[PDB]
Amino acid sequence: KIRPECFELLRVLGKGGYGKVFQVRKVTGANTGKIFAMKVLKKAMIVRNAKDTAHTKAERNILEEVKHPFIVDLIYAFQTGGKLYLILEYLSGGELFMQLEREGIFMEDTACFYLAEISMALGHLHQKGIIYRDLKPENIMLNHQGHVKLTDFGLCKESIHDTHTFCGTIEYMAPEILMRSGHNRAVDWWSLGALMYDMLTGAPPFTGENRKKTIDKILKCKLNLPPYLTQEARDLLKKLLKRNAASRLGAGPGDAGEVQAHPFFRHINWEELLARKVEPPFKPLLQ
Ligand SMILES: CCc1cncnc1N1CCN(Cc2nc3cc(C(F)(F)F)ccc3[nH]2)CC1
Ligand SMILES: [Zn+2]
């Protein structure tokens, strides 16, 4: 019988309008002493909104349904009168954002490793009919070894809200999401490109002085390909960051297989990648 009393709270990892994420220690059962992450949602906040209530259901369904090395693991889920609890694996490696912030610009080999692992996670989600939408580098964490974990499947984590599409940065989201004109898994391959661009140039591809100007630039999609990148990196970017969603690399029947076949990923051994037998560019434990 998993209860809130089965866990002691250690610290707040995140705080938002709908609740909190804690680092916790399990103090009962065979897992006594194990460290987890605990997401606690406020029911009252959520049930007063039909979309959020659906989104909260979707989150738990997704987590219970996916199982993949590069996607965060759900260990337990329960609820009380006022709270919904999700017990996730604790990831000690931080957000991908922090590595990018420290490094300024990734070397291409570094970027390739992360994008390669992410592509496998995306392919898994798409097989399950799930769209990730937003690969801004805060939405990707690293485990203790330095491997990728997609984490963002639930409610908007902001305290102030703009519907939640526009509540955080929109710089990594596809034009057709911003226009609300209907979309599909192709938006993830767009977002992979935006993240790649961020990794290799220091900033996402389309940024304006304000929110209005940023949206305009994304819709116009006039990509500036820096001349310094390899031909492979440039070609992959040009095929991901396209306004015509159907024509994006990855948007076809092959999905992730299409992207993973690109010359930019030519040195990647996918069997070894998936088994996490490939040495990551950064080791959080050593940092
Ligand atoms: C739960 C997976 C995880 C595993 N291991 C270590 N760190 C992790 N997280 C990943 C998520 N990250 C961001 C975040 N999501 C949030 C959601 C909320 C919400 F309750 F929905 F309002 C509030 C604050 C939030 N902060 C906090 C640390
Ligand atoms: Zn919001």
Residue numbers in the entry: 85 to 246, 250 to 374
Provide text from the study:
Ribosomal protein S6 kinase 1 (S6K1) is a serine/threonine protein kinase that plays an important role in the PIK3/mTOR signaling pathway, and is implicated in diseases including diabetes, obesity, and cancer. All of the inhibitors bound to the ATP binding site, lying along the P-loop, while the activation loop stayed in the inactive form.
Recently, the structures of S6K1 complexed with PF-4708671 were published, with either the S6K1KD protein or the protein with the C-terminal extension including the hydrophobic motif (S6K1HM) and its derivatives. PF-4708671 has an ethyl group on the pyrimidine ring, which is accommodated in the hydrophobic pocket formed by Val105, Ala121, and Leu172, next to the hinge-binding site, while F108 and F109 have fewer hydrophobic interactions in these regions. The inhibitor interacts with the hinge region, and its pyrimidyl nitrogen atom forms a hydrogen bond with the amide nitrogen atom of Leu175. The trifluoromethyl group contacts the side chains of Leu125 and Lys123 and the main chain of Gly103. Ala134 and Lys135 form the N-terminal cap of helix αC in the complex structures with PF-4708671, F176, and F177, where the side chain of Asp136 interacts with the hydroxyl group of Tyr102 in the P-loop. In these S6K1KD structures, a strong electron density peak was observed in the Fourier difference maps and anomalous difference Fourier maps. This peak was assigned to zinc for the PF-4708671 complex.
